[PDB]
Write a protein that binds this ligand. Structure first.
Ligand SMILES: Nc1nc2c(ncn2[C@@H]2O[C@H](CO)[C@@H](O)[C@H]2OP(=O)(O)O)c(=O)[nH]1
Ligand SMILES: Nc1nc2c(ncn2[C@@H]2O[C@H](CO)[C@@H](O)[C@H]2OP(=O)(O)O)c(=O)[nH]1
Lengths: 96, 96
């Protein structure tokens, strides 16, 4: 289930950077940015394989890629944020 | 993010000295010159560990290494100046 919506302005600033890269189709910092997200635990609506893609949301200070990600769906503005490595997802509201 | 491009001629003259040292591979005044800059805060573009190195820019009169540094990247002419101990960065243009 998606856990509600979150205003873009309430997320870490790096969430805004990733959306901007997603919009320009990169270039992305990591070679894993843009891989298909499988939605293997069925948290998001079931769709054909390849409908969802994931992109890193950089966590300043982490020594790795960390756990923040933006998952896009194929619908317009269908962008979900996860700060816990896919345990929970919130639909991003870009207007607040 | 990088704050913009600045002409080397517009930075303190000690920046020029540091770049000259880097071009000849030293010798450097401080033992810390040439250590890896981790880019831990993610202010500069994401790169592998060791792509960036830090060099002191002497602050006239200071008893310590102070807050000025030159960060080099592995790309041709990629050198950044920080006057606030890595809070902000500017790309150095050596052509002006
Ligand atoms: N948990 C989970 N990981 C997925 C899924 N689809 C792709 N992955 C990626 O496969 C890896 C296997 O654990 C995850 O770390 C994640 O890599 P990312 O770190 O790039 O997000 C999915 O549906 N669920
Ligand atoms: N803030 C910051 N310091 C770094 C980084 N990489 C190396 N350092 C150096 O590591 C220290 C301890 O964390 C910092 O005070 C700084 O010491 P210098 O002043 O010698 O560069 C980095 O990526 N960020």
């Amino acid at each position: 289930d998606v856990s509600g919506t979150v205003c873009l302005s309430a997320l870490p600033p790096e969430a805004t950077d990733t959306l901007n890269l997603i919009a320009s189709d990169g270039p992305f910092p990591y070679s894993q940015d843009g891989v298909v997200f499988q939605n293997r635990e069925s948290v998001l609506p079931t769709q054909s394989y390849g409908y969802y893609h994931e992109y890193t949301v950089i966590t300043p200070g982490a020594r790795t890629r960390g756990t923040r990600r933006i998952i896009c769906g194929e619908a317009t503005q269908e962008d979900y944020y996860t700060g816990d490595h896919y345990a929970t997802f919130s639909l991003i509201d870009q207007t607040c």
